[PDB]
Design a protein around this nucleic acid. Structure first.
Ligand SMILES: [K+]
Ligand SMILES: [K+]
Ligand SMILES: [K+]
Ligand SMILES: [K+]
Ligand SMILES: [K+]
Ligand SMILES: [Mg+2]
Ligand SMILES: [Mg+2]
Ligand SMILES: [Mg+2]
Ligand SMILES: [Mg+2]
Ligand SMILES: [Mg+2]
Ligand SMILES: [Mg+2]
Ligand SMILES: [Mg+2]
Ligand SMILES: [Mg+2]
Ligand SMILES: [Mg+2]
Ligand SMILES: [Mg+2]
Ligand SMILES: [Mg+2]
Ligand SMILES: [Mg+2]
Ligand SMILES: [Mg+2]
Ligand SMILES: [Mg+2]
Ligand SMILES: [Mg+2]
Ligand SMILES: [Mg+2]
Ligand SMILES: [Mg+2]
Ligand SMILES: [Mg+2]
Ligand SMILES: [Mg+2]
Ligand SMILES: [Mg+2]
Ligand SMILES: [Mg+2]
Ligand SMILES: [Mg+2]
Ligand SMILES: [Mg+2]
Ligand SMILES: [Mg+2]
Ligand SMILES: [Mg+2]
Lengths: 158, 120, 341, 102, 74, 319
RNA sequence: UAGGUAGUAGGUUUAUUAAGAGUUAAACCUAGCCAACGAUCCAUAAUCGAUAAUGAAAGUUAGAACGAUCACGUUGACUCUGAAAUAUAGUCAAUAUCUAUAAGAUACAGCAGUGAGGAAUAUUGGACAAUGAUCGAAAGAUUGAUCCAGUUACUUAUUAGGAUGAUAUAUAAAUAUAUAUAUAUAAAUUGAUUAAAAAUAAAAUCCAUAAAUAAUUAAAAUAAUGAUAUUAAUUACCAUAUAUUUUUAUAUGGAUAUAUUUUAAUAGUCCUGACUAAUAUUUGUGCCAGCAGUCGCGGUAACACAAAGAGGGC
């Protein structure tokens, strides 16, 4: 139907993509700074102003964001076997191989996701600065006086 | 297959022309219900090779599209592949011989072509 | 497809994509489409009647309406402004039926590999057509720019060649040919001088359109152009044919026939195993329809063709071959845009 | 594949058809005690010989087992409880406890 | 103009026009009623279908047979 | 106002008079016999000026308007012959001036009512070999051969492809006498292409007309401000038209600039093949959110626009 | 439907819960809260989409099919277990039926099927081969999920034959190549007497393919397993070698009597006064019979009724 136009004429839907990292990481410095920034007040403010009692039984401030330390996430989720146990049994060997592959996969997933997130912030920052510079250049060309401008009547003094 | 999160084929297409989505799904949901994620596609019918190609030595190819990175993540968090999906992942080189069974264990069968990773 | 009924009716006078004799007369006597005095609906209906008769008549109206594309494709010459000559208007609306030209059956007709679109469909359906080396047996297969398609040579010769006469039909032509040959040997022998004098005068009005004069010069070198009584004496009378005696026995018949032009074979049956008139000659009335398409490159020696592009409209020309003028196509386009409303 | 060799427990096809069970001893005339026929005939040939769907698939499964040195002992198909299937067990048991023990 | 009062299976009583030349409709005859009014008869807003139920097709109808429940002559 | 109109010839013809009751003839049938002329014992129409093909590279297309329906001529002298009161054919009383000086354009126009349809020029067997030998042996680019002989690049590429097929056919003696006879006959029916003749040369500056540009935008600028093709291209947010022409000339397989390598960046895996396996698995890397069959997509099977395609074997398959 | 609300609106405290709250229960306070931009009440309805229909579009319609969500499993309430259930469970009651007559069992909105209702919607089918689900260490078992087939023009698509084709005889000396072949005689269906046609329509001629027949035979699935299935497709004596985009071609080993299986083509339905495509006319009826979406038609030359001819759509 007409609705498909809004989505590239794609008919049907896919399940929403899950996020490997469910919270921001401790290396996403940009986000960490924003939450630490003082909250605004006034017309466009957020929070209870000084001297304004908050509702009894309610928390005055918002809960602190939980930043994930990928090193700690990896240490608690896919910890390595503490001892090199004797896997002489056929089933023990299969389990050891499967556990090793699973640990390799999930550690690569968490570290690739963190890298992607950090690399995406840098790319956006670079792209925005470029766009800003290009806009200034474009605007400067627009403001540049051409010879044709002499034929445009003007009343600058008035 | 066990667990609550399984990697299995969901059937699409028409009668007598099956195609499949490779999906991560809750064990209890319907086979063709919208899954957690769609990892790829499996077309079971091999591409037909012409008479000349056959003598030339061309082997029919079954085509699978798969997100290799996302699939590894789901194996990492304990998702359990179905038997057919297991065969596909072992052929792709994502899973290894630790996932083979006694009935399909090709312990002694000659390799005519070795898994080759290329760019195209 | 739509059943073929009364396609070549002279009263209706519809023009079809064929080389048929009756279809040539309908085209000859048409004298354009009359659109005067008709209301807008009547004009559109008439345009639809005429155009659809030629462009894809075998397609059902409902299928055609689905196939019909409102978007027409033209080209922009980027040097026009750098020429200085009076520019011509592009006939955009002659692209109304261009969507059909990419069909395999239409492509065969435009390549002159079949005598009509209907025959092209049967060639495709019977397994005689290949596209890019693969046998395609669906007339509705759509070609893409660069595709090469081929037709079995025997089928193309049967479409562009004369009809094979039957043994009985060709055996009555030889009987008459022998009678009219023995009359030329009785007039050459009774008064040889006049016949040779007439013979020389005929060769003056040949105009070079008749290659027989070129061959005749060879014959005059095989024997100043002065009369020779040895000629009349050399002439011999062929023996009459008893149709009943040699009836049902072709080898016998093709051993009792020996004419100066047709030797040891019945008329049109030099090789009865071939599916066409032998020796091969073009079908009657081929010149009026022999049009070389701008969108196909044809190799008649091998019966191969390449689909260069989809037909396009350019200043002063449309690559869509049509017997109808732009005003008729404009009315037809107006009809299908609104689904005949 | 290849033709396995007769053993002491399964000397001939008739012994093979008796060990697997599932009434497969009623096909002894189809095979004619020919060892090679049992290990060469595929489903298409067995279907042409009148073997029904269930039996021919079962034989081919046991032929593969024999070829791989896996046991060919009869495994029985499932059967409903004496007191009936779960959906009709409450009713059956109620009518069986009022006609046996009152 | 031949008409008929009919009690529909939903309890509504209507007046239906009987089309065609000649009809065998009587009281208690099972009829099928479709939409369509008889312009010159006020209050007759429906038509009975010829060749359905107990109403037979028009006898000896040659043209437009499908509209009068007449089967094709061999 | 509209009524059924029997398609009588627009030109004058001899209508039927009083008829014997058993003839049961029609005025359309008698008009056709007059167009065709007498039919000989061999089933031919020798008196009709269209029965036989031209052999001088000049198409013989119907000209009913210019000859006023007179289609009969002497089979050897090509001199007009018309029907007389006696029922015989003889010289016309007055020569037809409309048939002696025909415009060059009309000669190539097959249909009287459509002057926008013209026949194409046939390429001589020599020019084709020259083009074949320059692209393949000398190594010239299709752009060069196109700009040299005045042929569009797609046609140049097609000639190379077809000449290759004629060499294989001639190398295996597959071109029979009948095929040679037919080819020559058809060659002598069409006007031969002349690379030198400027009018015969094909335009080489044509580009497809986009749709966004098809609209008419107007800008009011200063009276002495220069505005050119490049400025217009920026306004319409399209590459310059000259650039489009240049990019369309580098598409030929033998043309300069032909390049295709930016796509060789998709990881592919070819699964191990073991003895006895009848097929090989090929895995192509994809991205979640793009790959897969979508859920709840529109079913078109019961709709007029149901998608129909063709597989590698040419078999019709539903998509 | 104009007033509604009385745990109603708010405050405080306890109980209960993993958890907020008149959410529930208890207590004590304040007099609030909603409402003509529609409260309360009544009626009706499962909701929606990157689904379907339509339109230039904004929109409108549907909610069958595909997918998402909710609710329910004859009706009501309650309880147990549990992370989660007022569970298709259990308890009690209601309605109906049944047999074993018990503080009994059953409730087809699971599949197939039957009666009823209705204008109207199908098999009491096959298989677990595939994809899944459950149990099992495994071997395996189960699966009306599912996959297949059956019924039904309900919808869509492909195919459902091309080229040639206005007559038949008799006719004509006794090979530098002819050639506008020419005469007689008979025959010629419906309409019509010329712009009145039916009609290239038919037959006939040429050449095909489908099916059949024969051989062969993928793929769905492999370690093995194929319900569909008398598989699709291909090939036309079969096999082989060489050359040979394809394809073609030659030659070979075996195979029949120099050739090699056979061979087609019966569409319906509506309409022709105008809107609205339909000019070749004619017969019956006579404001009757009937037709009709709108205007209207029919009272003896009816283009409109009922038909023949011819014609126009799909
Ligand atoms: K359309
Ligand atoms: K209200
Ligand atoms: K339903
Ligand atoms: K199963
Ligand atoms: K009709
Ligand atoms: Mg288990
Ligand atoms: Mg009527
Ligand atoms: Mg009209
Ligand atoms: Mg509280
Ligand atoms: Mg309350
Ligand atoms: Mg209280
Ligand atoms: Mg309801
Ligand atoms: Mg809605
Ligand atoms: Mg639904
Ligand atoms: Mg709604
Ligand atoms: Mg349903
Ligand atoms: Mg419930
Ligand atoms: Mg309930
Ligand atoms: Mg309950
Ligand atoms: Mg019920
Ligand atoms: Mg049911
Ligand atoms: Mg009923
Ligand atoms: Mg069953
Ligand atoms: Mg008569
Ligand atoms: Mg067949
Ligand atoms: Mg098999
Ligand atoms: Mg009358
Ligand atoms: Mg009318
Ligand atoms: Mg009438
Ligand atoms: Mg009639």
């Amino acid at each position: 139907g007409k609705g498909a136009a809004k989505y590239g004429f794609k008919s049907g839907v896919f399940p929403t993509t899950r996020s490997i990292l469910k919270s921001p990481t401790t290396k996403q410095t940009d986000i960490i700074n924003k939450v630490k920034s003082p909250k605004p007040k006034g017309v466009l403010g957020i929070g209870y102003a000084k001297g304004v009692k908050h509702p009894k039984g309610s928390h005055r401030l918002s809960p602190k964001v939980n930043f994930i330390d990928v090193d700690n996430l990896i240490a608690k989720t896919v910890a390595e076997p503490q001892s090199i146990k004797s896997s002489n049994g056929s089933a023990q060997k299969v389990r050891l191989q499967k556990a090793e592959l699973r640990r390799k996969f999930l550690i690569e997933a968490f570290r690739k996701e963190e890298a992607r997130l950090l690399h995406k912030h840098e790319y956006l920052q670079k792209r925005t600065k470029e766009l800003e510079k290009a806009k200034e250049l474009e605007l400067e060309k627009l403001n540049k006086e051409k010879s044709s401008d002499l034929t445009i009547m003007t009343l600058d003094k008035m | 297959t066990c667990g609550l999160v399984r990697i299995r084929l969901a059937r699409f297409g028409r009668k007598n022309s099956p195609v499949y989505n490779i999906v991560v799904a809750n064990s209890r949901k319907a086979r063709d219900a919208k899954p957690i994620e769609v990892l790829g596609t499996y077309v079971p019918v091999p591409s037909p090779v012409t008479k000349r190609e056959l003598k030339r030595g061309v082997v029919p190819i079954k085509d699978v599209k798969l997100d290799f990175d996302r699939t590894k993540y789901w194996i990492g968090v304990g998702a359990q592949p179905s038997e057919t999906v297991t065969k596909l992942l072992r052929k792709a080189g994502i899973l290894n011989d630790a996932w083979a069974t006694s009935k399909n264990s090709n312990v002694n069968r000659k390799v005519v072509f070795e898994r080759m990773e290329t760019l195209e | 497809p739509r059943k073929a009924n009364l396609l070549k009716s002279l009263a209706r006078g519809r023009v079809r994509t064929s080389f048929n004799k009756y279809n040539l007369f309908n085209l000859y006597k048409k004298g354009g489409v009359d659109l005067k005095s008709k209301s807008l609906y009547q004009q559109k209906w008439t345009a639809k009647q005429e155009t659809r008769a030629y462009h894809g008549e075998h397609l059902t109206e409902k299928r055609w309406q689905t196939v019909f594309k409102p978007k027409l494709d033209s080209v922009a010459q980027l040097d026009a402004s750098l020429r200085g000559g009076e520019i011509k208007e592009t006939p955009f609306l002659l692209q109304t039926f261009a969507v059909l030209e990419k069909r395999l059956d239409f492509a065969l007709f435009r390549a002159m590999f079949a005598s009509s679109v209907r025959q092209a469909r049967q060639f495709i359906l019977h397994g005689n057509v290949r596209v890019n080396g693969v046998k395609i047996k669906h007339p509705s297969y759509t070609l893409k720019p660069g595709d090469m398609f081929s037709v079995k040579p025997d089928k193309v010769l049967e479409a562009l060649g004369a009809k094979k006469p039957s043994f009985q039909e060709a055996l009555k032509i030889d009987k008459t040919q022998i009678v009219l040959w023995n009359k030329y040997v009785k007039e050459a022998k009774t008064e040889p001088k006049e016949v040779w004098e007439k013979k020389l005068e005929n060769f003056e009005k040949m105009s070079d359109s008749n290659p027989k004069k070129l061959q005749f010069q060879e014959f005059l070198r095989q024997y100043s152009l002065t009369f020779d009584p040895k000629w009349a004496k050399n002439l011999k009378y062929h023996d009459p044919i008893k149709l009943s005696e040699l009836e049902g026995d072709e080898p016998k018949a093709r051993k009792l026939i020996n004419l100066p032009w047709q030797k040891n074979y019945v008329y049109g049956r030099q090789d009865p195993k071939k599916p066409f008139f032998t020796p091969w000659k073009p079908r009657p009335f081929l010149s009026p329809f022999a049009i070389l398409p701008h969108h196909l490159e044809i190799s008649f020696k091998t019966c191969h063709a390449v689909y260069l592009r989809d037909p396009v409209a350019r200043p002063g020309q449309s690559e869509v071959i049509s017997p109808f003028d732009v005003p008729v196509h404009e009315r037809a386009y107006m009809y299908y845009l609104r689904n005949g409303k | 594949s290849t033709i396995p060799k007769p053993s002491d427990q399964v000397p001939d096809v008739d012994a093979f058809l008796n060990k697997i069970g599932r009434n497969c001893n009623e096909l002894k005339d189809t095979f004619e005690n020919n060892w090679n026929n049992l290990f060469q005939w595929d489903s298409k040939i067995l279907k042409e010989k009148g073997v029904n769907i269930q039996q021919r698939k079962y034989i081919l499964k046991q032929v593969h087992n024999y070829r791989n040195n896996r046991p060919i002992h009869e495994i029985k198909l499932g059967k409903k409880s004496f007191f009936g299937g779960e959906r009709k067990r409450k009713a059956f048991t109620a009518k069986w406890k009022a006609e046996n023990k009152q | 103009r031949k008409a008929c009062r009919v009690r529909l299976t939903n309890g509504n009583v209507v007046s239906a026009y009987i089309p065609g030349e000649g009809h065998d409709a009587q009281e208690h005859s099972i009829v099928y009623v479709r939409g369509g009014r008889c312009q010159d008869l006020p209050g007759v807003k429906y038509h009975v279908i010829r060749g359905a139920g107990d109403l037979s097709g028009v006898v000896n109808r040659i043209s437009s047979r499908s509209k009068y429940g007449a089967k094709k002559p061999s | 106002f509209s009524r059924r109109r029997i398609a009588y010839p627009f030109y004058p013809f001899k209508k039927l008079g009083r008829q014997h009751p058993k003839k049961h003839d029609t005025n359309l049938k008698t008009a056709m016999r007059q167009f065709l002329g007498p039919k000989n014992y061999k089933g031919e129409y020798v008196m009709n000026k269209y029965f036989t093909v031209p052999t001088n590279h000049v198409p013989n297309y119907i000209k009913p308007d210019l000859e006023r329906g007179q289609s009969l001529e002497h089979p050897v002298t090509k001199k007009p012959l018309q029907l007389r009161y006696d029922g015989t054919l003889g010289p016309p009383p007055v020569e037809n001036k409309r048939l002696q000086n025909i415009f060059k354009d009309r000669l190539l126009q097959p249909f009287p009512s459509n002057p926008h349809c013209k026949t194409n020029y046939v390429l001589s067997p020599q020019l084709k070999q020259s083009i074949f030998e320059e692209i393949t042996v000398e190594g010239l680019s299709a752009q060069q051969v196109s700009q040299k002989y005045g042929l569009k690049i797609p046609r140049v590429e097609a000639i190379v492809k077809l000449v290759s097929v004629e060499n294989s056919w001639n190398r295996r003696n597959r071109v029979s006498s009948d095929l040679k006879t037919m080819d020559e006959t058809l060659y002598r029916m069409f006007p031969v292409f002349d690379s030198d003749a400027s009018f015969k040369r094909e335009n080489l500056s044509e580009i497809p007309v986009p749709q966004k540009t098809l609209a008419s935008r107007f800008l009011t600028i200063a009276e002495s401000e220069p505005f050119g093709p490049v400025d217009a291209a920026h306004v319409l947010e399209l590459e310059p038209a000259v650039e489009t022409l240049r990019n369309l000339s580098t598409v030929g397989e033998h043309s300069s600039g032909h390049q295709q390598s930016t796509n060789k960046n998709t990881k592919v895996i070819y699964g191990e093949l073991v003895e006895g396996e009848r097929s090989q698995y090929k895995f192509t890397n994809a991205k979640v959110g793009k790959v897969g069959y979508r859920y709840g997509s529109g079913n078109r099977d019961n709709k007029k626009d149901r998608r129909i395609g063709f597989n590698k074997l040419g078999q019709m398959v539903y998509i």
